[PDB]
Paper text:
The novel enterotoxin of [name] W5052 consists of two unlinked components: [name], which acts as an enzymatic ADP-ribosyltransferase (ART), and [name]-b, a membrane binding and pore forming component. The structure of [name] can be divided into two domains, N-terminal (amino acids 3–211) and C-terminal (amino acids 212–419). Even though they had a low sequence identity (29%), the structure of N-terminal and C-terminal domain are homologous (1.3 Å RMSD / 133 Cα atoms). We conducted detailed analysis of actin ADP-ribosylation by each [name] and Ia against both α- and β/γ-actin. These characterizations show that newly found [name] is a unique ART which has different structural and substrate recognition features from Ia.
Using mercury-soaked crystal data, the structure of [name] was solved using SHELX against the single anomalous dispersion data set at 2.28 Å resolution. Using the triple Cys mutant structure as a template, the final structure of wild type [name] was refined at 2.01 Å resolution. The [name] crystal belongs to space group I222 and consists of one molecule in an asymmetric unit. There was a long loop at the junction between the N- and C-terminal domains. The overall structure of [name] was similar to that of other type IV ARTs. Comparison to Ia, [name] contained a flexible loop (A60-I67). The corresponding region in Ia (Y60-E65) forms an α-helix (loop I). Moreover, two protruding loops in [name] were not seen in Ia: G262-S269 and E402-K408, which are considered to be crucial regions for the binding of actin. Thus, these two loops were named PT-I (G262-S269) and PT-II (E402-K408).
Residue numbers in the entry: 3 to 419
The structure:
C-alpha cells in the first residue's frame, strides 16, 4: 500500500516501514519459482542482467542457460505483482559511461568539486535522449549516505503502475527492484553536495518506449496495423521500386546514394528514378510514435575493413578507441536505412560486430516495408535517405556463440535527428 510520500528523500525510517509492509505481502504472493528467482537476483544480479542482453541480441535458435531464462521470466512476473499506485522517486549513484559521456566531471584542481566545462557539456549530452535501460534495475528509497566514488547521483521518478518490488536481506536497507523494458529521460540537472563532496544530480523520468526486442507477434501486428494501408495505397511505380529495393535492389541503390557509383547495366536516370520513387513512398506515412529499431552494421559503415586491426573488439584497447572516436558524434546518412524492429540477430549478418539500436522518432519518414507480401518475416522498417543520427552510447557485450562469431560486439545507441 502507498500511504507515503512520493519521495522519502532522506527519511529512512518511513521508507523502511513502507518497504517492510509491502515486501512481506509481496513475498506471500509469490510462487516458489518466483521466490527462488528473486533470491537468485539478490545473489547474482550482474550475471542475470548480462544474460538478458546476450539473449535479446542472439540468433533465433539460441538456447542459452535454462535457469537464467527462468530467472528473466520469473523476476518479471514477480515484480509485476508489486506495481506502484502512485509515483515513487528512487536513488542510485552512477558513472559517466551509462550516459555515454567520456569527459571527467571531477575538477582537476579539487576532487570534491565538479568541473564547470565538463558539467556544461554533460548538460548538452543528456538532453534530447532516451537512455535505454538494459536488464532489471535495483535502486534505493532514499538519498544514499555512502561515500560514493561516483560522479553522478540519479534521482529517478518511477511513474504510477511501475512494477517496483521491495526486496533484500537487510530489512532496514530494503532495495527496490524495477522491471525491465524501460528507459531514462532526464528532467533536470544540478550540483549537490553530500558529505562535503559534489555530485551531478540527474533528475530523470522512467519512461517506456515502443521496443519489441524479441516479440515477433507484437512487432508484426504493429507493422501490419500501421502500414498495411500504406502498402495498398502506393502508386504502381512506388510499389514496384520498393519491391525492387527489397528484392536485392537495395545494394546498387544505396551504393549509388553513398558514392554515385553506377555499374552500367543501369543508368543514372534509372537509379535516380528508383530512389525518387522509394523516397516518395517513405514520406507517405510518418512513423506514428517513437520506436526502437535495429541494424547489424558492417564494418565499412564506420570506416573499417573486416580485417582492420581496429575492428578487433576482443582487445579492450580497440573498444576504447572506438568509444573515444564515435561517442557523441553525429553521423550523416546519404543512403536509405534498412532496419528491423527486432533485436534478434540475423543469419546473413550473424557475425557483424556493430549493432545499431536507433531511436526512431515519431514523425520520421520511414515505413514498415515488411507488410509487403513475401517479406513478413523480415520485420523491416526502411528509413528515407538524408537523415543523420547522433551516437548516445556504445556498450560492449560478448557474443560467445560460434555463429555469432565468438566476439565482443558493440550496441550503439543512437537517436535519429
Amino acid at each position: 500500500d502507498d500511504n507515503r510520500p512520493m519521495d522519502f528523500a532522506k527519511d529512512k525510517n518511513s521508507a523502511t516501514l513502507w518497504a517492510k509492509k509491502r515486501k512481506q505481502v509481496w513475498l506471500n504472493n509469490l510462487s516458489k519459482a518466483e521466490s527462488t528467482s528473486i533470491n537468485n537476483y539478490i545473489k547474482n544480479s550482474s550475471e542475470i542482467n548480462s544474460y538478458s542482453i546476450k539473449k535479446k541480441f542472439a540468433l533465433d535458435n539460441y538456447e542459452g542457460i535454462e535457469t537464467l531464462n527462468e530467472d528473466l521470466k520469473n523476476i518479471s512476473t514477480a515484480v509485476k505483482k508489486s506495481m506502484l499506485t502512485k509515483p515513487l522517486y528512487v536513488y542510485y549513484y552512477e558513472a559517466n559511461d551509462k550516459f555515454g559521456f567520456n569527459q571527467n566531471l571531477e575538477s582537476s584542481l579539487d576532487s570534491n568539486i565538479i568541473d564547470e566545462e565538463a558539467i556544461n557539456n554533460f548538460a548538452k549530452k543528456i538532453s534530447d535522449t532516451n537512455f535505454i535501460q538494459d536488464g532489471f534495475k535495483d535502486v534505493t528509497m532514499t538519498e544514499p549516505d555512502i561515500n560514493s566514488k561516483l560522479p553522478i547521483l540519479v534521482h529517478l521518478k518511477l511513474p504510477t503502475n511501475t512494477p517496483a518490488a521491495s526486496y533484500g536481506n537487510d530489512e532496514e536497507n530494503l532495495r527496490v527492484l524495477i522491471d525491465q523494458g524501460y528507459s531514462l529521460k532526464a528532467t533536470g540537472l544540478s550540483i549537490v553536495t553530500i558529505k562535503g563532496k559534489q555530485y551531478a544530480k540527474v533528475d530523470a523520468d522512467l519512461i517506456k518506449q515502443l521496443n519489441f526486442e524479441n516479440d515477433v507477434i507484437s512487432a508484426s501486428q504493429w507493422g501490419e496495423e500501421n502500414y498495411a494501408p500504406w502498402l495498398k495505397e502506393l502508386t504502381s511505380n512506388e510499389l514496384r521500386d520498393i519491391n525492387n529495393y527489397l528484392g536485392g535492389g537495395y545494394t546498387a541503390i544505396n551504393k549509388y546514394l553513398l558514392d554515385g557509383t553506377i555499374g552500367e547495366n543501369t543508368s543514372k536516370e534509372d537509379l535516380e528514378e528508383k530512389i525518387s520513387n522509394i523516397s516518395s513512398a517513405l514520406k507517405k506515412r510518418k512513423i506514428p510514435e517513437d520506436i526502437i529499431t535495429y541494424r547489424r552494421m558492417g564494418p565499412n559503415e564506420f570506416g573499417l575493413d573486416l580485417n582492420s586491426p581496429d575492428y578487433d573488439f576482443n582487445k579492450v584497447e580497440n573498444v576504447s578507441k572506438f568509444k573515444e572516436k564515435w561517442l557523441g558524434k553525429t553521423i550523416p546518412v546519404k543512403t536509405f536505412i534498412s532496419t528491423t524492429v527486432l533485436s534478434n540477430n540475423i543469419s546473413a549478418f550473424a557475425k557483424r560486430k556493430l549493432i545499431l539500436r536507433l531511436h526512431l522518432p515519431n514523425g520520421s519518414n520511414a515505413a514498415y516495408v515488411s507488410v509487403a507480401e513475401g517479406y513478413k518475416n523480415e520485420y523491416e522498417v526502411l528509413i528515407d535517405h538524408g537523415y543523420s543520427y547522433k551516437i548516445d552510447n556504445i556498450t560492449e557485450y560478448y557474443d560467445e556463440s560460434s555463429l555469432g562469431g565468438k566476439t565482443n560486439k558493440l550496441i550503439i545507441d543512437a537517436t535519429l535527428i
